[PDB]
Design a binder for these strands. Sequence first.
DNA 1: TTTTTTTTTTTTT
Length: 460
Amino acid sequence: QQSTFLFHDYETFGTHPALDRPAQFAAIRTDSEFNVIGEPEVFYCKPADDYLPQPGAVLITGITPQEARAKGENEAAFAARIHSLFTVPKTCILGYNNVRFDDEVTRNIFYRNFYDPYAWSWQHDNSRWDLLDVMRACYALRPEGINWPENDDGLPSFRLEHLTKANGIEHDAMADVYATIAMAKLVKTRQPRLFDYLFTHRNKHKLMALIDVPQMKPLVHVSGMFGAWRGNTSWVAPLAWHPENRNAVIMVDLAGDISPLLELDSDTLRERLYTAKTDLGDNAAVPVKLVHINKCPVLAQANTLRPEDADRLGINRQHCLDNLKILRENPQVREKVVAIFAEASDNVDAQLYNGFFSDADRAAMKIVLETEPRNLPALDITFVDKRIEKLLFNYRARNFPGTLDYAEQQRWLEHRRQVFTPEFLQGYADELQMLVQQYADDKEKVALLKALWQYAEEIV
DNA sequence: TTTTTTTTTTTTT
Ligand SMILES: [Mg+2]
């Protein structure tokens, strides 16, 4: 049984992993060294008739719902192809921004179509990765050997195509699958030691081994939330485990200003923390970040950021060191910072994270999954979690409408009307109109916009 | 195994 990597990319009909719908899936299996060892896997998803794609998405992809309808299968079947692949044992599933995008799409796809939302990321020696912060880490800590591209600002960029184009390699789902593989090869070759460190430290216990909460042991963290002006980097001190989020540890940015932490109380810090930057004043921002141990965060030994590297990124070493001393010498801050986080929708599509399912409920859902579509009306199952009845109804109506009775068909009509209100339909047309006037002399973009209008006429 | 819709930021469609 061989360890593989499954590189994958989704095209979608919008940015929202729960509310929007997938259009296309692309994947290829490689060996540990990133040599291709299987056929390309590309296929489309038919959108159910309770949905209209966002115009912006479709303009970027070039994939129309008509195209997807013609070329694809229903979501249930789409979910089932994606799942067989994903649950091949000893598979590491990865892409480019997948942890914060594609993996969300996957969780919701399995959630909607009765597969476990997470098991593909851990069962049977499975795992996941994401090359995005690998690229960021490399630039920040061992930039040598790779060309780092900039914007009209001078800031380093990490858009995939910007990176591949800058390194003489090369929208199209399968093309992005190759670009990701190519990017994995590049770093592996130019910086194997860092690559090894980041691969090994995906592990949460490996990460906990690095996290010393009681002593506030300083670390280097790379993250987009720091922004390209610092090359996404800073030194960090772990203060506490998040009181409500098992996968989060509360951390202080040692480069920021630690006086609002020293001075304000917990309630004022909380209020300060949740004020936007624009409607923030002459006041300092609270320099606290959550780091999520399950999301392949880049966390290394403090001294991994080399003096010259810190100097390149313009990160004040002594300032950090000063803050770390103060924080260690003011234990009460920890009490306040934790208290910040100890405070705490009718669409079932949006309620995946409401919680796990009981044991009765998972066995029942298992049976939903194993039943031929045609046989579900004959089932009559009882669930406890109120999500499931709704999950089931959407599942059946969206994927197997030939299967619904009149009551169910009436319920579905109602549902469609509640989605396609006149106010929603007005909003959709306005956007299309607005867009057709912006790209009036673009034969490609005008024809997409037009196909989107027709599709709305034809399904609503 | 997980964090949904207050903040940071940048990328994903
Ligand atoms: Mg992508």
